[PDB]
């Protein structure tokens, strides 16, 4: 046979992500003395729409403590942030929406966003619209913090990891149906070349493992092993259960 679409997506070429309309990556300030020991104030000047991202971004300008310069940063906006608002990033910052605090300085039950997996990677968890990470446990002796992710997972991260207090703006985006095909086309033409998608059962045996036959059918179980060969993975991969659950 030939190289499948799944294998061809990893070479780059037409399958790379869109770049032009997307201005700056959304991440926290680098961890420094001001955030590690006290707090630093920044001014939220713009709330912008990121093409390809459902969550609005916030352009916030801070001051350089070491030189005479204004530093602009791009944060993921939480629901309630407005232009002209002073946000405070640091250890001694207050528990206000938009403030960035380490997880050791927040109480349990606090919901945070753009949470760092490791102190210094400028935010990894809970970054999409309407999502949040819940601070569910603390361990001061080991310096650890248990958090709950939007997938239902619970994870343990170092307590020096930072997170913006609040819930990411743009919630309920997926509730509205994308009535027309053009709406999905516009949604994916700003992200990457993955739309429209052709079913493998409508293909030829040269094109995909599901192709061929006088009737359109899979021909075997749709669950495929984890250690399958490259190109043998097409369908449900390493599934522990299948079917519709009653709940």
């Amino acid at each position: 046979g030939r190289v499948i679409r799944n294998q061809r997506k990893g070479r780059g070429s037409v399958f790379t992500a869109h770049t032009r309309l997307r201005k700056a990556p959304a991440k926290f300030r680098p961890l420094d003395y001001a955030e590690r020991h006290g707090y630093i104030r920044g001014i939220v000047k713009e709330i912008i729409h990121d093409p390809g991202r459902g969550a609005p971004l916030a352009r916030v300008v801070f001051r350089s403590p070491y030189k005479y310069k204004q530093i602009t940063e791009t944060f993921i906006a939480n629901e309630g942030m407005y232009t002209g608002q002073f946000i405070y990033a640091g250890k001694n910052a207050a528990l206000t929406v938009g403030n960035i605090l380490p997880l050791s300085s927040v109480p349990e039950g606090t919901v945070v966003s753009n949470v760092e997996e490791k102190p210094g990677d400028r935010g990894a968890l809970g970054r999409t619209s309407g999502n949040y990470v819940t601070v569910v446990g603390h361990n001061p002796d080991e310096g650890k913090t248990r958090i709950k992710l939007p997938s239902g997972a619970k994870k343990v991260v170092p307590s020096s990891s930072r997170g913006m207090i609040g819930i990411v703006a743009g919630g309920g985006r997926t509730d509205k149906p994308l009535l027309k095909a053009s709406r999905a086309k516009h949604k994916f033409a700003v992200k990457r070349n993955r739309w429209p998608k052709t079913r493998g059962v409508a293909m030829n045996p040269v094109d995909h493992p599901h192709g061929g036959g006088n009737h359109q059918h899979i021909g075997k179980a749709s669950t495929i092993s984890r250690y399958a060969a490259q190109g043998q993975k097409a369908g449900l991969i390493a599934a522990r259960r299948t079917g519709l659950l009653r709940g």
Partner: protein, 91 residues
Amino acid sequence: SKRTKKVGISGKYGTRYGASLRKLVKKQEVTQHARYTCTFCGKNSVRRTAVGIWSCKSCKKTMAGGAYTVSTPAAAAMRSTLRRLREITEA
């Protein structure tokens, strides 16, 4: 003089996409295109600019809110429990 008995703002969609899907999308379309009272100036001039972005025409203030609503009940409960935790931590 009401022109459509039931579809309302979904009347632009014709007979297409299904009655239930038109009924579902009617709520987000109405809530999205409605005008809102500003928290900062009190004028009925807050309208959606992009998804999650709500700008006021009078005072020129831009807020981050829900996708089709100016605020979400999850964010309101977040504010409530957040001020709860602020009060507990402070005193």
